[PDB]
DNA sequence: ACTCTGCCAAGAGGA
């Protein structure tokens, strides 16, 4: 810490206390929050101390001090020997022991026990298997998840897996197999991949068919009914006898298909292709075991990797049933089945290797000292093996990451042939490109690793559904009796009743991602899926697995899938931006190097002659700035930035552009971040009888757009052939999807003249990149004065992560067209944001818009009804509030004590809440439709309070939401509770945001009511400035004391 | 691989394969439409449709004189189209291909016709690329693509294989009318663009014309239809 | 110092 100068410094800088425990408890929390330490089967231990030393025999050994209580009551001495000594465990890590310590100097060594580093990070078995040959490859696979692209061999494999899995339930008769092959080949999920890959349907059928006789030979050998000596003889020596005497293997039946398993004991996850019932026959005697079977198409290798996967599957199995001790590898090409015994040595080395992978995945951010700038950590070293690297699909990212981020400070160490390969791979990139890639990887990792994206599954497998039912996110005591109906395999409808006191008292809306477990611990993580209907009697979900194997007796529990912070799409986009193709180069030059976007001068021949008149008729409907935006796009060679200020008719303008582009015969890729934004444009285009195709899952799509989706058209038109699927994909020049939908097969085959991105200023910059790879020219619509992409991590925000792509490109002024004619706000309301934010640029679109006031047909009567409660005759504030000719009003709460309530990092104000609930009633009574009213508040916690009190006053149907949920929307009347009001002066960061306030001030058509403490709020620059303008026109009205007759009946 | 497979079938005479019939041979939703087409046909005609549907390679339909070649190909095209296959329809002459198309037009089956419109039957001209471009003012790459993708059925002559479409599209099936009159290496041309194929011909009728005696002596008038006929199971 | 919508996913082979 301190840098010493005299001898006194040296003396006083000597330490030793125990607060180092807290330094590590906080550290553990940062990455595994709210992990309850305990003993027993699912033990959780925090690491306090780590020391390497020499053993009684001159060899290296590691010793740890661990604890299974948040209390400093126990410190257990754990000793790790032989290979285990090199476990990269650090003070502050969460660990799990296989074999919880019963004895007090607890030894884990080559012969006994497993040590699990970060048990709650469940790593897939296939990643672990792939890490055998290269640790770095495995990490790159896990992070840049779309860099191992879809092949023809992989499609064959997928189909054959499905055929075998259908067959093993039914029959392996040749005619049935041929049937299964014919039917499977027509499934859209497979047709999509044939399209992606530009393959011929019958070619794939032929390839699949070549395998069928091997399927029959296998079933012939292992599933025949016959004498036990007629089954194939093998040696299969398990720890269970005493063995080493050949035996006959009979496959009785499949018990399960596609069984997914999460292991919090081993930090593993996987999918077993087939779980089989097997009889092992030996010397007239029989033993029955339930065993995992792994299917493999292609080469019959019986490789270390393949065998290791099976061994991992036998670990995974222990989370459901007794240890199978071995599994099976079937090479479908030949029908050959290999036993895989799971020896202690194998499980040991594999779990050691899993620790290294968990460590490398977790330690992504380096920090020179605690509090110095964040850096990306090096990946595991580039390996020596030429053969491995040559065949590696991650080489692009490997070279990229080597060159952009880890580039040697002092020592290279990298093999020379691999060294010049990096050079070949990355030579097309400039310094600025490397820096940009590096910076966005770091920011994404920081945001990804933020505490909110870090919660573990512990609550599901540890606490009963009993505890979290009094919380808002879990339901328990569930059951099913009904048949499981199927939409398409990967979707299975399940009905769950309570069979007890009906419990719907939970915060769980339809379309919510959920994890079904049994309440029994051995039935954890059965199926993922979404909830479709949410009755008070029952709850219905679409789940990926068919759970009828389970007895009706079993009791189920629902739990929400929380935000794990997935960044693979934006990482994929960045990687793609670094590739050496002309489209990527051009994007790097425009986006990274800010190359000036080009535009030609207008000429008669800019548009195809035959389109000119149709385009003219569209243009006539538009205002001048709108027309100017169309013109800029038509003249562009690169991109256009349309600034959609509030109320300027974003959706009208994009719809019109799409019509113009379509009339011109361009193809158009229409995108936004959200479903409803894209759907809003499409509703307009549907009205103009413009054809488009909509991609995406149909349940996420607007009801009136659903008939336009791929999914509905496939179902509706029985699409069952590659040519008919293609026909659908080519049927419209206009293709509409969300920014995250860029993995659709269409994007491997089609490019577009133009991409249009709505809401571009709200979208994370590397997410916004995605569609841009598929079009020649592009158009971003946005407003940087409105909300930016949300970034939760402070350091990432400090680095620039909330700069949207729309904002970045805005320095190129020649590309920018501002929409300024607005049709939402009346002159007084518009005037406000014109002064605060838009430098006077907004204009009302008509006198009607300018002069509009809140319609209150029943005002006289509502006014009179109040007199029952208090004398509002001559009340400064109430008349001011209700008066339609007073569109803007601020209610200062300084004289009414109206303090804030702070609990759990959120902020509320009961007094403010009571006030808006009263105001909302009065307005409804005055003749304002509840659907014409919106309540805004900055803090999420306040909304709960407002919602409850409105329910209590029989007036629940008014919208209560944060600023963010009102993006691009309006209401006739808006009421804002600016919650902050305190003596001590605690300011948030939230009210410091000019954009947040701007969006609040621009949601209102006719009346805008603002409520809060002037003296608290004026301390925030946006509010201070607001108050200067409100004052200059006397719009701030002071509420009296809470004792005063006009408030006491409310407060 | 496509060239290898053709060398093996045509040069090395690899036996063309066929599966046994099963309910699931045709997409379920096509079965009834196909049944109505089949009912109109005589037994040998039906048997020809069946052979094609069961093939993995090719089929040889022997159209003896007066047996309704154009009726039979039209019917096959309807069956294939109902099944959602894409089809490349060819012959050596314009009027042969046009004859099939006149029937298909009557059944309201959509197709695109390639070729210069003046070589094409007057009642087929409106179906040509050339006429559609003129008629619809096609002036953009996306509109041109749209026209090329608008029909699973594309119809041209054997010599028309240089059309840009063949650099971008492949077909489930190619059908070659008059295959027994066509020079064997000319008959090859469309076959590069489809997975499976159907040759219609009759070796008892006129062979490709070969004027040179020595070339004729060497085998030059063996049509591709004739060469493939040793594989009886395809016939 | 509290603001939140999108992605189906672990493996389909390659040696
Ligand atoms: N060029 C224009 N001329 C007249 N009115 C317009 C124009 N552009 C937008 N508007 C009006 O402003 C509103 C724009 O909002 P928008 O979200 O685009 O459509 P809507 O709210 O009708 O779905 C529309 O209600 C429309 O009446
Ligand atoms: N399956 C059938 N059933 C009844 N009549 C048929 C059948 N196939 C062909 N024909 C008859 O034989 C003739 C076939 O000659 P073709 O060249 O195919 O048609 P067209 O001469 O009518 O253009 C037709 O005129 C038709 O009447
Ligand atoms: S290239 Fe060689 S080093 Fe880089 S990841 Fe693939 S295998 Fe590991
Ligand atoms: Ca498998
Ligand atoms: Ca696999």
Numbering used by the authors:
A (entry chain A): -2 to 13, 20 to 245, 248 to 1056
B (entry chain A): 587 to 821
Authors' description from the paper:
We determined the 2.3 Å crystal structure of full-length mouse Dna2 (residues 1 to 1062) bound to a ssDNA substrate of 21 nucleotides (nts), 15 of which are well ordered. The overall structure has a cylindrical shape with a central tunnel through which the ssDNA threads. The DNA crosses over from the helicase to the nuclease domains over the next two nucleotides, which are in the vicinity of the β barrel domain in the middle of the tunnel, but do not make any protein contacts. The subsequent 6-nt segment binds to the nuclease domain. The Dna2 nuclease domain binds to a total of four phosphodiester groups, two before and two after the scissile phosphate group. The scissile phosphate group contacts two calcium ions, one (Ca-1) through a non-bridging oxygen, and another (Ca-2) through the 3’ bridging oxygen of the preceding base.
Dna2 has nuclease and helicase activities and plays key roles in maintaining genomic integrity. It is involved in the nucleolytic processing of 5’ flaps during Okazaki fragment maturation, of DNA double-strand breaks (DSBs) during homologous-recombination mediated repair, and of stalled replication forks in the intra-S-phase checkpoint. It is a ssDNA endonuclease that requires a free end for cleavage, and does not cleave dsDNA, single-stranded gaps, D-loops or RNA.
